[PDB]
Amino acid sequence: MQDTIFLKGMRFYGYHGALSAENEIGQIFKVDVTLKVDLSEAGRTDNVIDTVHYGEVFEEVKSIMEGKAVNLLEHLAERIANRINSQYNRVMETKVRITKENPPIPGHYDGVGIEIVRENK
Amino acid sequence: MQDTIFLKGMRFYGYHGALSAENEIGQIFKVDVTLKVDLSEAGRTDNVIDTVHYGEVFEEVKSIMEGKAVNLLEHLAERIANRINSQYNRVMETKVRITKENPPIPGHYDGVGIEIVRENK
Amino acid sequence: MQDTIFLKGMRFYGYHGALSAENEIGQIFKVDVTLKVDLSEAGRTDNVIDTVHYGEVFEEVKSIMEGKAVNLLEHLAERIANRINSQYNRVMETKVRITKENPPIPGHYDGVGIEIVRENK
Amino acid sequence: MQDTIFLKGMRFYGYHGALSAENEIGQIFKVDVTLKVDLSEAGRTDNVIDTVHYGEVFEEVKSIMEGKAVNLLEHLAERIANRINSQYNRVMETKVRITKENPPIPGHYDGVGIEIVRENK
Amino acid sequence: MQDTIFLKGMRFYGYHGALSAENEIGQIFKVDVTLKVDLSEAGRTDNVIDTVHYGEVFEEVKSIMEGKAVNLLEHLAERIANRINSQYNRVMETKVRITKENPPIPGHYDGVGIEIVRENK
Amino acid sequence: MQDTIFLKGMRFYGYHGALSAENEIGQIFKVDVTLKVDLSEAGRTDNVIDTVHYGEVFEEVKSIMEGKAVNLLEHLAERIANRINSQYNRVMETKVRITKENPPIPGHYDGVGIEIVRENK
Amino acid sequence: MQDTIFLKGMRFYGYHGALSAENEIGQIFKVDVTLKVDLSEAGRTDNVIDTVHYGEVFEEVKSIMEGKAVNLLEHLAERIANRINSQYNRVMETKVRITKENPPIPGHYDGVGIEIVRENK
Amino acid sequence: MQDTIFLKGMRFYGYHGALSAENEIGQIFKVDVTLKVDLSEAGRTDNVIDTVHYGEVFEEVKSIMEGKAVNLLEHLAERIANRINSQYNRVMETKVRITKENPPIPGHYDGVGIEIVRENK
Ligand SMILES: Nc1nc(O)c2nn(-c3cccc(C(=O)NCc4cc(Cl)cc(Cl)c4)c3)nc2n1
Ligand SMILES: Nc1nc(O)c2nn(-c3cccc(C(=O)NCc4cc(Cl)cc(Cl)c4)c3)nc2n1
Ligand SMILES: Nc1nc(O)c2nn(-c3cccc(C(=O)NCc4cc(Cl)cc(Cl)c4)c3)nc2n1
Ligand SMILES: Nc1nc(O)c2nn(-c3cccc(C(=O)NCc4cc(Cl)cc(Cl)c4)c3)nc2n1
Ligand SMILES: Nc1nc(O)c2nn(-c3cccc(C(=O)NCc4cc(Cl)cc(Cl)c4)c3)nc2n1
Ligand SMILES: Nc1nc(O)c2nn(-c3cccc(C(=O)NCc4cc(Cl)cc(Cl)c4)c3)nc2n1
Ligand SMILES: Nc1nc(O)c2nn(-c3cccc(C(=O)NCc4cc(Cl)cc(Cl)c4)c3)nc2n1
Numbered sequence: 001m002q003d004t005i006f007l008k009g010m011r012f013y014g015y016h017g018a019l020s021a022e023n024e025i026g027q028i029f030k031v032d033v034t035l036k037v038d039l040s041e042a043g044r045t046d047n048v049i050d051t052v053h054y055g056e057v058f059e060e061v062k063s064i065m066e067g068k069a070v071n072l073l074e075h076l077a078e079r080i081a082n083r084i085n086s087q088y089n090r091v092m093e094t095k096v097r098i099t100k101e102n103p104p105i106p107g108h109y110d111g112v113g114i115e116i117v118r119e120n121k
Numbered sequence: 122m123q124d125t126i127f128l129k130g131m132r133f134y135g136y137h138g139a140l141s142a143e144n145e146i147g148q149i150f151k152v153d154v155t156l157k158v159d160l161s162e163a164g165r166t167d168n169v170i171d172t173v174h175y176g177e178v179f180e181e182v183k184s185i186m187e188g189k190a191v192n193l194l195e196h197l198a199e200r201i202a203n204r205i206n207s208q209y210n211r212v213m214e215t216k217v218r219i220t221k222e223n224p225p226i227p228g229h230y231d232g233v234g235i236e237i238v239r240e241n242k
Numbered sequence: 243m244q245d246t247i248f249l250k251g252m253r254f255y256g257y258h259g260a261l262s263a264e265n266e267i268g269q270i271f272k273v274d275v276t277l278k279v280d281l282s283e284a285g286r287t288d289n290v291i292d293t294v295h296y297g298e299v300f301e302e303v304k305s306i307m308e309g310k311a312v313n314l315l316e317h318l319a320e321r322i323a324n325r326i327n328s329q330y331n332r333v334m335e336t337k338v339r340i341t342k343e344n345p346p347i348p349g350h351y352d353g354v355g356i357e358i359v360r361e362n363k
Numbered sequence: 364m365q366d367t368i369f370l371k372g373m374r375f376y377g378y379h380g381a382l383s384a385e386n387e388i389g390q391i392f393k394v395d396v397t398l399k400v401d402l403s404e405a406g407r408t409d410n411v412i413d414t415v416h417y418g419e420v421f422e423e424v425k426s427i428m429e430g431k432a433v434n435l436l437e438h439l440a441e442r443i444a445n446r447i448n449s450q451y452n453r454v455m456e457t458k459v460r461i462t463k464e465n466p467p468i469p470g471h472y473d474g475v476g477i478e479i480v481r482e483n484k
Numbered sequence: 485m486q487d488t489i490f491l492k493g494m495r496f497y498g499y500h501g502a503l504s505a506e507n508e509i510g511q512i513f514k515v516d517v518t519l520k521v522d523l524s525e526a527g528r529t530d531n532v533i534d535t536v537h538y539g540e541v542f543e544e545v546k547s548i549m550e551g552k553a554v555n556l557l558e559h560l561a562e563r564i565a566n567r568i569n570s571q572y573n574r575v576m577e578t579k580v581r582i583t584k585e586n587p588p589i590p591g592h593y594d595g596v597g598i599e600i601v602r603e604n605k
Numbered sequence: 606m607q608d609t610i611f612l613k614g615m616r617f618y619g620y621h622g623a624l625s626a627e628n629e630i631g632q633i634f635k636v637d638v639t640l641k642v643d644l645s646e647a648g649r650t651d652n653v654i655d656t657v658h659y660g661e662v663f664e665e666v667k668s669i670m671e672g673k674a675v676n677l678l679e680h681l682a683e684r685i686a687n688r689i690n691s692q693y694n695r696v697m698e699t700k701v702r703i704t705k706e707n708p709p710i711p712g713h714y715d716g717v718g719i720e721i722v723r724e725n726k
Numbered sequence: 727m728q729d730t731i732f733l734k735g736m737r738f739y740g741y742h743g744a745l746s747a748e749n750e751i752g753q754i755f756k757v758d759v760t761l762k763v764d765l766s767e768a769g770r771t772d773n774v775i776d777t778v779h780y781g782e783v784f785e786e787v788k789s790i791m792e793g794k795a796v797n798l799l800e801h802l803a804e805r806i807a808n809r810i811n812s813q814y815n816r817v818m819e820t821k822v823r824i825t826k827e828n829p830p831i832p833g834h835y836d837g838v839g840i841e842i843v844r845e846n847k
Numbered sequence: 848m849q850d851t852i853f854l855k856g857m858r859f860y861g862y863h864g865a866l867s868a869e870n871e872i873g874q875i876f877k878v879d880v881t882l883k884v885d886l887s888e889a890g891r892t893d894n895v896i897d898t899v900h901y902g903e904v905f906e907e908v909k910s911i912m913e914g915k916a917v918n919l920l921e922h923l924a925e926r927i928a929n930r931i932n933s934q935y936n937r938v939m940e941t942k943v944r945i946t947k948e949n950p951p952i953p954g955h956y957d958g959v960g961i962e963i964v965r966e967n968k
């Protein structure tokens with residue numbers, strides 16, 4: 001099963017980061033969420049109730065990304081993957097990519113980050 | 122067999138969407154179609170009759186994307202995958218990605234959507 | 243005097259638009275603000291009090307862009323230009339560009355909009 | 364008066380061109396339309412009837428761009444500028460930029476074209 | 485073994501195409517070549533003679549892309565894959581992607597094409 | 606008179622440069638040519654003989670850009686402006702922009718170059 | 727005289743900013759330098775000694791951008807414009823644009839900054 | 848285990864290359880580093896000591912990329928992969944992609960390079 005529902009380049013201004021200055025100033029966090037969901041029933045029925053509502057998924061990510069500042073990106077993605085897997089039984093597995101395109105790293109790059117993949121139990 | 126014929130970033134202005142306002146205003150739908158087709162005979166012969174005509178594939182997608190408004194993206198991709206698989210025996214499997222770069226979702230993102238993969242029976 | 247302070251590609255999700263569906267669904271509004279300000283004193287002193295704080299300008303634009311839905315883009319830019327000119331005597335003139343990259347216009351384009359230039363009296 | 368209403372990157376698939384093969388195959392024409400219009404009344408009133416409707420302008424350009432194939436780009440822009448100036452008295456002057464990003468020119472470039480500016484008499 | 489040598493976005497102005505007008509006018513062909521090559525010896529030695537010279541590979545592709553006009557893209561990629569596999573024993577497998585970003589297809593898309601993967605015998 | 610004919614992002618691989626290594630290795634030169642030409646007659650007639658053929662202009666630039674290696678970019682643009690002004694009486698003035706996006710300058714930038722404007726005598 | 731020598735998108739990681747956290751963490755500063763210089767003699771002679779060496783200009787900007795942290799962008803551009811005007815008599819006027827694409831401003835934008843133009847006395 | 852820590856588009860100005868002129872002039876090297884690391888503990892704890900510090904990884908790559916000029920890209924990636932694997936036991940495998948977007952290759956392309964994948968023993 002290779003069907004997926006996706007949310008790309010979600011951007012939130014947050015204050016996460018292991019550095020005090022980071023939590024003080026904050027920055028933009030870019031998020032990519034991919035959900036493994038069998039989309040054949042919805043493909044057949046065309047009934048929104050037979051699939052996962054991207055809108056509700058963006059609200060979940062947003063609430064975690066725009067809330068309490070944490071240290072790691074690993075923690076933020078773990079909470080999101082867990083939040084989505086928890087509320088949706090149709091999501092067989094959740095992939096969360098978080099990128100800090102502008103960390104307090106002296107240099108020239110496009111970004112740094114982490115990406116986790118969690119299966120729904 | 123990893124050979125493929127592709128159609129990227131196809132864009133159509135449609136009126137699909139589960140929201141009444143969506144069907145009223147409409148929006149742009151971005152489509153990516155990938156077909157698994159063994160391209161060795163055509164690679165050998167150079168005869169257009171030994172492969173699938175990208176042009177005819179764009180016409181199929183277009184007819185579905187620019188026609189009757191449906192609710193889901195899942196339904197639109199299911200119809201396209203089914204339409205292409207049905208008319209072409211050389212297409213071993215069809216992958217359809219549909220993206221709503223500008224849905225009625227209050228926020229900052231690059232887009233949302235679904236992607237299905239269907240083998241040709 | 244060709245000195246300027248600028249704010250590019252400001253993006254807000256608003257509900258302005260002459261169409262009921264627009265006000266219902268909303269969309270992203272892209273804003274570009276250019277202020278004619280003589281930056282020599284600040285260039286000499288390096289004292290933030292000798293120039294206009296881009297931060298405070300983004301807050302002004304934001305408050306207008308994320309507030310009450312209006313019909314025209316002309317109205318939104320008129321309010322911003324007026325809001326900035328009013329609070330800052332150092333701003334000799336304000337240029338406001340507002341773009342609807344995704345209006346309810348069936349077609350393929352990069353965007354539509356208006357740009358006004360207002361001198362500060 | 365520096366106020367303007369704009370339509371950027373309008374793209375139409377047409378068959379214009381001085382070469383027979385061009386008229387046969389056709390290509391994509393990119394269009395940029397800028398109109399000098401005093402937007403203060405609309406900025407004050409917020410009444411759509413006090414300005415020029417971008418939507419109606421895109422329809423005008425479209426009708427000319429997607430209609431009868433002509434030889435030059437100069438002819439296409441002349442017809443558009445003339446069509447817009449003619450129907451709208453509020454448009455003090457019209458600027459039309461037409462680009463052939465992919466002409467039958469053997470080489471590497473981003474595009475070629477023309478841009479005209481016509482005042483409304 | 486996941487090591488690879490790559491050549492991205494190679495662009496050639498050619499006259500291939502199943503349509504007479506295409507062969508007459510010509511267009512730009514974008515090419516992506518990926519070669520599976522074990523790069524550990526070169527990684528150890530730092531001797532250019534222990535790996536495949538990207539330069540020589542671009543010359544091979546170029547000669548095929550800028551030469552005799554053929555009908556299919558499948559034929560062009562088959563000749564390149566075959567040309568590279570043939571001259572280099574270190575290339576375990578060759579992947580060739582050819583894209584016609586501007587075919588004689590009336591519509592809006594980013595491109596169409598084919599991609600083949602050939603193992604070296 | 607604000608009418609113009611343009612050629613953007615022309616790219617040639619040349620060997621110009623004041624450094625011996627430059628002339629040895631060569632690089633890509635990006636060129637932008639803008640010609641002030643009154644396009645009303647052509648806009649009226651639609652006869653290609655009433656305007657300047659972008660194709661012939663690209664050939665002129667190409668011949669200078671892909672020919673003998675010189676030291677400066679100033680010299681290359683001077684020769685092009687002079688070559689175009691000389692052959693076309695309809696060109697009232699020529700603007701030539703040449704960019705070295707990748708000069709032998711240790712650093713991070715988008716490019717360096719020169720742009721000249723020459724009126725046709 | 728419209729001739730110019732330019733340096734675009736120069737990027738330096740600096741620690742300027744009126745906020746303590748800024749000076750602590752630092753960020754990337756994007757710089758655009760435009761110099762009004764009559765390039766006809768160099769265009770005629772092709773002698774590098776008849777124009778301004780872009781390389782030496784990038785070194786000047788770099789030294790100021792990568793040195794002592796200051797508060798304003800106005801101060802940084804004032805020092806650069808002054809540094810370039812001072813050492814080069816051929817530079818009739820200097821234009822310096824500095825952009826903070828990622829300031830400590832909670833929001834979505836492409837960047838903020840200032841641009842000054844200084845004539846050489 | 849599909850978890851990864853990444854560093855994209857790292858850019859360094861180096862002097863590596865098998866050609867004398869290359870070592871003389873130098874160029875920009877673009878680097879992409881992907882590390883397979885189980886990020887669940889850090890996702891649970893939120894303690895930076897339970898994962899690999901992207902910052903320290905960029906310093907490692909930088910030291911190799913901005914140091915002694917070598918001949919091959921294969922050698923540079925081998926040293927980096929080896930340097931990262933060596934210092935971090937949590938890194939199960941390292942993927943290094945190095946690209947020369949502007950090699951001394953006469954032509955039009957986006958870049959050339961190599962990518963290696965090394966498991967940590
Ligand atoms: N995996 C992970 N996830 C995060 O969110 C991290 N944040 N930091 C982090 C925290 C504090 C400072 C820095 C940092 O400064 N990185 C670049 C750098 C700069 C300097 Cl001057 C010195 C060093 Cl050692 C590193 C990084 N490391 C992380 N790893
Ligand atoms: N899988 C899928 N496919 C589609 O085509 C969908 N369309 N919508 C959809 C329909 C109607 C409204 C919205 C929507 O508004 N999403 C964002 C949003 C905004 C607000 Cl204010 C509130 C909520 Cl709950 C969601 C989404 N969900 C889909 N799922
Ligand atoms: N100057 C200006 N500013 C705005 O904010 C505008 N909004 N609209 C506007 C309002 C309502 C609908 C439309 C619209 O639909 N435009 C495209 C279009 C589609 C169709 Cl199907 C038919 C027409 Cl006539 C126009 C535009 N015109 C504006 N002009
Ligand atoms: N101003 C203008 N506007 C247009 O729309 C034009 N179309 N052509 C045009 C017509 C037919 C062919 C070509 C063309 O082929 N240009 C490139 C070229 C290729 C070759 Cl092989 C030879 C030459 Cl001389 C030119 C251009 N010149 C124009 N000028
Ligand atoms: N696999 C493959 N490879 C190629 O290189 C092809 N070239 N064409 C091709 C040849 C001639 C014309 C067209 C074409 O016009 N495609 C779009 C189109 C336009 C119109 Cl008006 C009508 C149709 Cl049926 C198709 C495509 N099909 C290919 N398939
Ligand atoms: N106006 C102009 N036009 C050109 O084409 C130029 N080419 N060079 C040029 C020639 C040779 C070397 C360099 C150069 O290396 N520039 C960057 C640089 C690097 C180093 Cl290590 C040292 C210095 Cl001083 C400059 C530039 N200066 C020019 N000016
Ligand atoms: N002209 C100019 N130039 C600079 O370099 C500036 N730096 N700052 C500056 C300094 C310190 C903080 C901020 C800032 O935070 N801006 C955004 C902002 C965020 C919040 Cl939470 C509150 C406010 Cl008032 C502003 C800006 N204003 C400048 N003006």
Ligand SMILES: Nc1nc(O)c2nn(-c3cccc(C(=O)NCc4cc(Cl)cc(Cl)c4)c3)nc2n1
Nearest residue numbers: 535536537538539540865866918919920951952
């Ligand atoms: N795998 C690999 N890695 C590198 O870093 C390489 N560098 N070169 C390399 C070295 C010297 C010159 C050239 C080169 O010039 N390539 C293009 C080219 C130009 C010309 Cl005129 C002639 C030829 Cl044969 C090749 C390439 N080949 C490599 N292979």
